[PDB]
Amino acid sequence: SDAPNFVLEDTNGKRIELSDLKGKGVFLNFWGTWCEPCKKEFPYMANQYKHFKSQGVEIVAVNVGESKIAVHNFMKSYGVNFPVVLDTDRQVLDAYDVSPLPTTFLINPEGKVVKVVTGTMTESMIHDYMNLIKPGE
């Protein structure tokens, strides 16, 4: 199924449209600072991103309704080095019908969702998930 398109601003105020990432694999992660597991998983995602960014995998971590400052503080505290967007009114979350947080939609270069992941992700799992959606090499 096609991943619902959306437009949100990243933490730097830059406009990000999902459809603009076609051709690349997208690790679409919905999260909140109240998700303790993200304190563990974000560093893992950042560590793997050091490798997969140059493999054509992009991460779009959609924060669910929190302020720019609260998000920026969490990014600084937990070593984020990947794109984070602000779903200020939770409309994108609702569009994806996401309930458990965090939830990750693995989107292939075609823009189709190939897997939906929820629950604890080890760094090994995150590594394998990024390998699943990478466009080449």
From Swiss-Prot:
The gene is resA. GO terms for cellular component: plasma membrane. It comes from Bacillus subtilis (strain 168). This is Thiol-disulfide oxidoreductase ResA. The lineage of its organism: Bacteria, Bacillati, Bacillota, Bacilli, Bacillales. GO terms for molecular function: antioxidant activity; disulfide oxidoreductase activity. Pathway: Protein modification; cytochrome c assembly. Belongs to the thioredoxin family. ResA subfamily. GO terms for biological process: cytochrome complex assembly. Disulfide bonds join 35-38. It is a single-pass type II membrane protein. Thiol-disulfide oxidoreductase which is required in disulfide reduction during c-type cytochrome synthesis. May accept reducing equivalents from CcdA, leading to breakage of disulfide bonds in apocytochrome c; following this reduction heme can be covalently attached. Does not play a role in sporulation. The keyword Membrane applies. The keyword Transferase does not apply. It is found in: Cell membrane. Residues 1-135 form the Thioredoxin domain. Keywords: Cell membrane, Cytochrome c-type biogenesis, Disulfide bond, Membrane, Oxidoreductase, Redox-active center, Signal-anchor, Transmembrane, Transmembrane helix.
